[PDB]
Design a protein around this ligand. Structure first.
Ligand SMILES: [Zn+2]
Ligand SMILES: [Zn+2]
Ligand SMILES: [Zn+2]
Ligand SMILES: [Zn+2]
Ligand SMILES: [Zn+2]
Ligand SMILES: [Zn+2]
Lengths: 202, 142, 362, 200, 21, 145, 95, 134
């Protein structure tokens, strides 16, 4: 009756090269408990920064414990070894891990694995690292190596979508016209991309 | 107009510099009574900054670049709140001449301990884009 | 930019059409052969399109032909085309109207949109080229069945009830439309307003059908009362009511012309006389089909053999009306089925709709 | 309820004055038995109905003697129903337009018999009727009536169409009654007999 | 017991009615 | 007025009960359009206890009020209440309950009342069948032809 | 016309007595015993028919069709049924 | 301008200031303390104070402490005592003040619309002797 998951209060966000950017000279901001996790809802450490010039001022989404679970980016939510979705990596290597969908069981199991990682070393993408070494079978035919900046490209100016961005080029949001809303690739549920279930990009 | 805190006789050259301060006080009144909706939240603050910067620039030119006003009457306008003495003193610095606001140079206002980007020299921009400040709406006031 | 903002408006219109005077177009067939309406004659369905009333002996089949779908929500009205069963029309409640070939074809023949609320009722003209759809936005739109463009629109002061076309060939543009505030309007499409108004009915109208061609039309209101009135006449001298039924949500005429089925709210299907002695038989009723407060289609099969009734749980009841007993019950699909019509082409087929958005052909 | 004026004192050591619901009765502190007794006395819009009955009764009294007091017209002032309860503001209750120039006396008491009518002269006039709930400590009515007259005629929110008018304060808790204000000739003994028969 | 089973059957009937509607 | 009149009927004095039941009879005769049927059958619940008064005129006027309320609010819940009460009385009363049941039937079309009374005859409780038959005899005498 | 008055916003009526007619506490009713629903102070402070020609010498047939006398004669000479709902008018050219 | 905006917390433009406003509850007692320590004096007409104000306008403390010289303050209040003795001894009819001064429907008025544009009236302020009070 006195059970809760502890808070992700740590440095060192584990990020992609793509969201990491191109500048070696990086200025950084860190919020301690500014937001919560997008999956397990623990109050996590927010890392916000500017990788380049034409930027979204990108920041981390989920907690470091969830990123330690799934080996995905804290912003991009794609797997750090290949740049691929975790649905693609789980279909390629092992899809027997999964996650409970109910909130109470999810938080209890999250507290269990959080205790497990806290008793463990700290830098390990949990149990399937021993079975994830057999890679480059087919997934490296299309796995990215380039730092993709067109997904780090900032959000669309909805005011100029309505045609009414009076700022023009002073507006830091994108003054290009948006993608297709009828396109299923534009849907992109964040929990689906975490869970590896029916992600349209995957 | 402005309620006089001194409640005394103003000096001699006040009587011809007062309509400029009267219309600038009406500019303060319209910057108070403008609607915030439509432009942005922080955008409506910037005419107050820029027009008060023009007020302080006008009195700064009365006392320094023309010396057309006296010292005691210049201090009377300071004590009546027309002129920002600190903004005048920062304009008297070598590298700070077109300084739009004292909020623009505060290192505690920035998260990185910096100044505003309209304080940056125009040769040191390296980013492009129509530069307009968040504090005051200034466009390259270095 | 102007063309960029036009592309943004096209993307916004695509988002609005995905959400569901702007109408959609269904399929690329359009006019077949040398050019004809899609709702006139498909010339591909089974049996004879120009057949008589009794094709054969009526039997209850347990099968599925077409699942159709298309509609995002449950279609409030399901009707057929003129004369033959070469086309079926569904008034989808997302302000949509769909027309299909009604013979197992998955592609819809025609589409129509432009309303703001749910389309409550749909009817066709005597020729079969004009389709009048009445919605909940106090207006009825008459549109072309082959192009989907709205030819005309007529508004009303009250909410629109079930609007039907007159059975007379001389009066094809005269539509009998009910209103919420106790009115029945015989409105001409050429005049644009209510040519004749009858306020003698009490309550909102439910179903207006033709007991006889150009002699008397039977309108059923929210109360359990059916009134037979002549077209453009001030006085109605035929009415039926009782203190057992609570409401008359559905009143329909059989294809044989010997009896009329009124799906009353007291879980009964009253059989009224289609002659001048318009009396409802208490013995000849169907208590095996339950209609509590939900509208349905108490319809009849060929040669007055079967009577079809709907239920809110999704189970349709077929009764041998010659034997006056419930012969069969179809419990297909997990959606609520209200309207059901036996096919005039083949006697072994029926057309119904569901609340999940699928039109079922049996 | 029997010892109600003894305990509903205006002067308390500590106590917050609050108006009781749908009345003009001011209450300091929370006495629930007296609150129950006073509410069950004054239930069903009783204060407003009593004030409206008094206003309509005096309007009919001046409706018989419209002529002999030289009055063009007597106006029933259509007020909000909370005007009988509000003590902050006070509009006119009865508007008099005279047939000629009334030679109007100064603001003086109802019991002021030695009253000279020669202060001013005017045509329009107003009558205001206020009801109070006095106690043992503040049972007087005449000083209250003149204080309310000089605090409402000077008040901008208390709307009066004429400078000349009368305010009649009636203490319902003690069956007491007084009036103060301007007077035109022929008013005062007729007014006194009228209000005496109204309380009768 | 039997009343709870009848209430569960009526709740299942309402569940299929809500699924049909 | 009738919410004020509702605790007045709980008085134990006979002249007060007679005059109050007469006033309720005039009210339930004329003004059925101000009082909810919940309060009407609450008045019926009071009159079930008030039927044990000594005066036959008081019990007769109670029967008349039951007929007025049955004409006003409908005959269903009052017949269910009287069917509960008549089997539960079983004392030196309840012939007036049968008389009231007969008036509820006769003023409000006994074809509705008769299946409920016929099913209540099937209760084996040794006095409810006598109540059914007494109400039947009284009702047949009231309706005649 | 501002007339905001600080009322007593606690009406201590007995809720059991008010909508039933009976309180179980009775003499020990902490609230008051009344059944009424008048407005409170804060609530008040918040507050030829087809031809449509001229009608002369009217006559009605047996099918409740109102027309003229000559129109009733024409209907009786034409049909046994009237123009209302083709009911049994039986050619009634009566006044 | 901040006070003229955010009017009774209505707009969804200021929607992200909800928690910034609701975090104020710790500090209005200290704001009331610093406000009520610094009334302008009866011989004063207008007193202006330094104000430590939040950027959202959630709170505005009086960022000063009133320090006064004791014999100056005592002789000032002795003068004030003398003129209130003179005022009751000389005024024929004092009028007492209404409480509350504003109605419950009367809103808090704007300072620029009502008070900043008008001149203050006279304070108490005895004439001092050029010879004796030199
Ligand atoms: Zn990344
Ligand atoms: Zn997490
Ligand atoms: Zn600046
Ligand atoms: Zn700047
Ligand atoms: Zn600047
Ligand atoms: Zn009580």
């Amino acid at each position: 009756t006195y059970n809760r998951q502890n808070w992700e209060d740590a440095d060192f966000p584990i990020l992609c090269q793509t969201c990491l950017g191109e500048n070696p000279y990086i200025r950084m901001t860190k919020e301690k408990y500014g937001k919560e996790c997008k999956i397990c809802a623990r109050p996590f450490t927010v890392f916000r920064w500017c990788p380049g010039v034409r930027m979204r001022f990108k920041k981390t989404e989920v907690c470091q414990t969830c990123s330690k679970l799934k080996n995905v980016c804290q912003t991009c939510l794609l797997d750090l070894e290949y740049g691929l979705p975790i649905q693609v990596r789980d279909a390629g290597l092992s899809f027997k891990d999964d996650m409970p969908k109910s909130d109470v069981n999810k938080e209890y199991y999250t507290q269990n694995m959080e205790r497990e990682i806290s008793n463990s070393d700290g830098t390990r993408p949990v149990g399937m690292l021993g079975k994830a070494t057999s890679t480059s079978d087919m997934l490296l035919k299309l796995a990215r190596t380039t730092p993709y900046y067109k997904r780090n490209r900032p959000h669309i100016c909805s005011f100029w979508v309505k045609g009414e961005c009076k700022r023009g080029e002073e507006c830091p949001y994108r003054h290009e016209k948006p993608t297709d809303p009828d396109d299923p690739l534009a849907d992109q549920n964040i929990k689906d991309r975490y869970y590896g279930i029916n992600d349209p990009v995957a | 107009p402005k309620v006089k805190r001194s409640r005394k006789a103003p000096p001699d050259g006040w009587e011809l510099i007062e309509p400029t301060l009267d219309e600038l006080d009406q500019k303060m009144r319209e910057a108070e009574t403008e609607p915030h909706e439509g432009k942005r939240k922080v955008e409506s603050l910037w005419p107050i900054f820029r027009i008060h910067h023009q007020k302080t620039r006008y009195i700064f030119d009365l006392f320094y670049k023309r010396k057309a006003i006296s010292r005691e009457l210049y201090e009377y306008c300071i004590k009546e709140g027309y002129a920002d003495k600190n903004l005048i003193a920062k304009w008297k610095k070598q590298g700070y001449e077109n300084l739009c606001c004292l909020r623009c140079i505060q290192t505690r206002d920035t998260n990185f301990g910096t100044n505003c980007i309209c304080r940056v020299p125009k040769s040191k921009l390296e980013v492009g884009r129509i530069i307009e400040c968040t504090h005051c709406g200034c466009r390259g006031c270095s | 930019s102007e063309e960029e903002q036009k592309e943004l408006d096209e993307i916004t219109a695509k988002r609005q059409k995905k959400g569901k005077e702007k109408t959609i177009l269904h399929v690329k067939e359009m006019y077949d052969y040398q050019g004809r309406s899609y709702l006139h004659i498909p010339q591909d369905v089974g049996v004879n399109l120009r057949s008589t009333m009794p094709p054969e002996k009526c039997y209850l089949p347990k099968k599925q032909i077409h699942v159709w779908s298309g509609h995002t929500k449950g279609v409030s009205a399901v009707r057929l085309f003129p004369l033959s069963g070469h086309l079926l029309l569904s008034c989808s409640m997302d302000c949509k109207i769909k027309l299909w070939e009604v013979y197992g074809e998955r592609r819809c023949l025609r589409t129509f949109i432009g309303h703001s609320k749910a389309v409550r009722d749909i009817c066709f003209n005597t020729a079969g080229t004009q389709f009048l759809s009445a919605a909940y936005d106090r207006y009825l739109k008459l549109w072309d069945t082959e192009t989907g463009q709205c030819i005309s629109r007529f508004t009303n002061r009250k909410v629109p009830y079930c609007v039907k076309f007159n059975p007379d060939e001389d009066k094809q543009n005269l539509f009998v439309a009910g209103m919420s505030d106790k009115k029945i309007v015989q409105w001409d499409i050429r005049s644009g307003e209510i040519v004749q108004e009858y306020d003698r009915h009490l309550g909102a109208v439910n179903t207006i059908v033709f007991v006889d061609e150009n002699r008397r039309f039977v309108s059923t209101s929210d109360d359990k009362s059916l009134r037979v009135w002549e077209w453009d006449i001030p006085v109605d001298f035929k009415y039926i009511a009782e203190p057992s039924m609570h409401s008359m949500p559905a009143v329909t005429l059989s294809p044989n012309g010997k009896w009329l089925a009124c799906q009353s709210m007291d879980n009964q299907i009253l059989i009224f006389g289609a002659q001048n002695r318009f009396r409802l038989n208490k013995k000849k009723i169907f208590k095996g089909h339950m209609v509590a407060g939900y509208a349905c289609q108490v319809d009849f099969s060929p040669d007055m053999s079967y009577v079809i009734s709907g239920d809110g749980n999704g189970k349709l009841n077929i009764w041998d009306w010659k034997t006056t007993k419930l012969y069969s019950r179809f419990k297909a699909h997990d959606k609520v089925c209200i309207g059901a019509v036996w096919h005039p082409h083949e006697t072994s087929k029926v057309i119904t709709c569901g609340w999940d958005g699928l039109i079922k052909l049996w | 309820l029997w010892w109600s004026p003894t305990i509903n004192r205006a002067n308390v050591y500590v106590g917050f004055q609050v108006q009781l619901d749908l009345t003009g009765i001011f209450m300091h502190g929370k006495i629930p038995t007296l609150k129950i007794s006073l509410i069950q006395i004054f239930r069903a819009h009783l204060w407003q109905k009593i004030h409206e009955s008094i206003v309509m009764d005096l309007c009919q009294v001046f409706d018989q003697e419209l002529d002999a007091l030289e009055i063009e017209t007597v106006q029933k002032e259509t007020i909000h129903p909370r005007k009988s309860y509000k003590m902050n503001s006070s509009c006119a209750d009865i508007l008099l337009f005279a047939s000629y120039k009334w030679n109007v006396s100064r603001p003086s008491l109802l019991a002021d018999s030695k009253d000279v009518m020669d202060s001013t002269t005017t045509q329009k006039y107003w009558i205001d009727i206020q009801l109070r709930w006095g106690d043992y400590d503040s049972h007087d009515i005449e000083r209250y009536a003149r204080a309310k007259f000089l605090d409402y005629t000077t008040d901008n929110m208390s709307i009066y169409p004429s400078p000349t008018g009368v305010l009649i304060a009636i203490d319902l808790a003690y069956n007491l009654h007084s009036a103060y204000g301007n007077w035109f000739p022929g008013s005062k003994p007729l007014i006194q007999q009228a209000m005496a028969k109204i309380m009768k | 017991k039997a009343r709870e089973k009848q209430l569960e059957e009526a709740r299942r009937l309402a569940a299929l009615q809500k699924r049909r509607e | 007025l009738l919410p004020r009149l509702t605790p007045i009927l709980k008085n134990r004095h006979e002249k007060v009960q007679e005059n109050c039941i007469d006033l309720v009879g005039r009210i339930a005769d004329r003004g059925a359009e101000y009082v909810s049927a919940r309060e009407w059958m609450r008045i019926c619940f009071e009159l079930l206890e008030l039927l044990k008064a000594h005066k036959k005129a008081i019990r007769r006027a109670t029967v008349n009020t039951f007929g007025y309320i049955a004409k006003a609010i409908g005959p269903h819940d009052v017949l269910a209440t009287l069917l509960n009460n008549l089997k539960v009385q079983e004392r030196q009363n309840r012939v007036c309950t049968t008389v009231a049941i007969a008036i509820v039937a006769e003023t409000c079309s006994p074809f509705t009342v008769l299946p409920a009374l016929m099913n209540e005859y099937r209760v084996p409780e040794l006095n409810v069948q006598n109540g059914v038959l007494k109400s039947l005899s009284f009702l047949f005498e009231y309706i005649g032809e | 016309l501002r007339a905001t008055v600080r009322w007593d916003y606690q009406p201590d009526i007995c809720k059991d007595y008010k909508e039933t007619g009976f309180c179980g506490f009775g003499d020990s009713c902490k609230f008051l015993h009344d059944r009424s629903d008048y407005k409170h102070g804060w609530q008040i402070e918040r507050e030829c028919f087809i031809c449509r020609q001229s009608f002369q010498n009217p006559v009605v047939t047996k099918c409740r069709h109102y027309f003229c006398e000559s129109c009733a004669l024409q209907h009786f000479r034409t049909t046994p049924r009237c123009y209302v709902c083709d009911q049994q008018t039986n050619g009634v050219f009566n006044p | 301008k901040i006070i003229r905006d955010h009017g009774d917390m209505t707009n969804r433009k200021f929607r992200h200031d909800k928690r910034v406003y609701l975090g104020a509850l710790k500090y209005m007692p200290h704001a009331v303390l610093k406000l009520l320590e610094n009334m302008p004096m009866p011989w004063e007409q207008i007193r202006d104070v330094p104000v430590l104000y939040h950027i959202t306008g959630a709170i505005s403390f009086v960022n000063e402490i009133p320090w006064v010289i004791e014999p100056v303050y005592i002789s000032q209040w002795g003068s004030m005592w003398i003129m209130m003795r003179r005022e009751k001894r000389d005024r024929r009819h004092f009028k007492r003040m209404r409480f509350p001064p504003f109605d419950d429907e009367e809103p808090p008025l704007d300072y620029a619309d009502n008070i900043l544009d008008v001149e203050p009236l006279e304070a108490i302020q005895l004439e001092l002797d050029p010879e004796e009070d030199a």
